[PDB]
């Protein structure tokens, strides 16, 4: 239902997530400057779901969108080569997800943590 919430540029911190040109990114750099005696920020983010580098400049008082992140847990049911079928531990619904490019030891019966944000999903950690 809800995709993103509005927040002031000025409240953003490195390591947080923000929407830039429609892409949810993790902030890796923030430069804030005050001209004379309104502040302005330059934000550099890298995609959470895709390999992309985005950036924007905006007054610190402006509003920007931040994706609302759904943190979930599921159980690995099957590993078909590259993609893994997991069962969400709350809905008992099944979904197929790509196997994280650099993930630890994944195997059936095991539990994972995955996230959904603005219609996209990604496996983040192995909960076991």
- The technique by which this structure was obtained is X-ray
The answer to whether the beta carbons of residues 5 and 119 sit under 8 Å apart is: no
Distance CA 21, CA 63 (A): 14
The answer to whether the beta carbons of residues 64 and 12 sit under 8 Å apart is: yes
Domain extent at residue 83: 69-128
| Residues 40 and 83 grouped into a single domain | no
> How far is C-alpha 107 from the chain's CA centre?
24
Q: What CATH number does the domain containing 97 carry? A: 2.40.50.140
The three state secondary structure string of 25-77 is: EEEEEEEEECCCCCCEEEEEEEECCCCCEEEEEEECCCEEEEECCEEEEEEEE
| Residues 14 and 76 grouped into a single domain | no
For residue 10, give the 3-state DSSP assignment: helix
């Amino acid at each position: 239902m809800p995709g993103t919430k509005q927040v002031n540029v000025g409240s953003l911190k490195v390591g947080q997530y923000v929407m830039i040109d429609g892409v949810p990114c993790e902030i890796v750099d923030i430069s804030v400057s005050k001209p004379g005696k309104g502040a302005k920020a330059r934000v550099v983010g890298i995609g959470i779901f895709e390999k992309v580098k985005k950036e924007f400049v905006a007054p610190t008082s402006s509003k920007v969108e931040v994706p609302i992140i759904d943190r979930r847990k599921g159980q690995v049911l099957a590993i078909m080569g590259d993609m893994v079928q997991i069962m969400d531990l709350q809905t008992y619904e099944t979904l197929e997800l790509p196997i994280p490019e650099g993930i630890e030891g994944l195997e059936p019966g095991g539990e994972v943590e995955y996230i959904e944000a603005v219609g996209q999903y990604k496996i983040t950690r192995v909960i076991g």
